[PDB]
Chain A
């Protein structure tokens, strides 16, 4: 349930948007979720905190 929530929220906010991806892409996303789980309180905080100047999409990307 948590894995599917992360996939839906990070890639469109809808199930159809996630299904627009390929199985390989979904595998990558799910394994990144696993990475986040394994760090949890000890991993690097750049996995969820965007450093200033980063070019990747932000929270208002789909809004």
Chain B
């Protein structure tokens, strides 16, 4: 998949179909971060850097900073 011009790298298969069919998958050994692993969404279960900090919260933080940048002089104007 892509996010703008940033494309997610994909690992090339190395096993042949015959060898691959003989592989037994045991997700009990997998880490909890990667279970029901999906190539189209590998980070669905990945932990947040800061607990409770959503992406929307950061976006809104930036929006508020922009509003402050544009509106601070309207409330606290300064002379030349």
- Chain A: residues with CB nearer than 8 A to chain B? 4, 7, 15, 18-19, 21-24, 26-27, 30
Chain B at the A interface: mostly helix, strand, loop or mixed? loop
Chain A at the B interface: mostly helix, strand, loop or mixed? helix
Total interface residues on B, CB under 8 Å, equals 6
Q: Is the CB of A18 within 8 A of B77?
A: no
Contacts of B80 in A (CB 8 A): 4, 7, 15, 18-19, 26
Q: How far is the CA of A18 from the CA of B78 in the complex (A)?
A: 12
- Chain B: residues with CB nearer than 8 A to chain A? 73-74, 77-80
Q: How many A-B residue pairs have CB under 8 A?
A: 19
Some 19 contacts from A to B, beta carbons below 8 A apart, are: A4-B80, A7-B80, A15-B80, A18-B80, A19-B79, A19-B80, A21-B79, A22-B79, A23-B77, A23-B78, A23-B79, A24-B77, A26-B77, A26-B79, A26-B80, A27-B73, A27-B74, A27-B77, A30-B73
Contacts of A18 in B (CB 8 A): 80
Q: How far is the CA of A24 from the CA of B78 in the complex (A)?
A: 8
The 7 closest A-B pairs by CB, nearest first: A23-B77, A27-B77, A23-B79, A18-B80, A26-B80, A24-B77, A23-B78
13 more CB-based (< 8 A) A-B contacts, given A19-B79, A21-B79: A4-B80, A7-B80, A18-B80, A19-B80, A22-B79, A23-B77, A24-B77, A26-B77, A26-B80, A27-B73, A27-B74, A27-B77, A30-B73
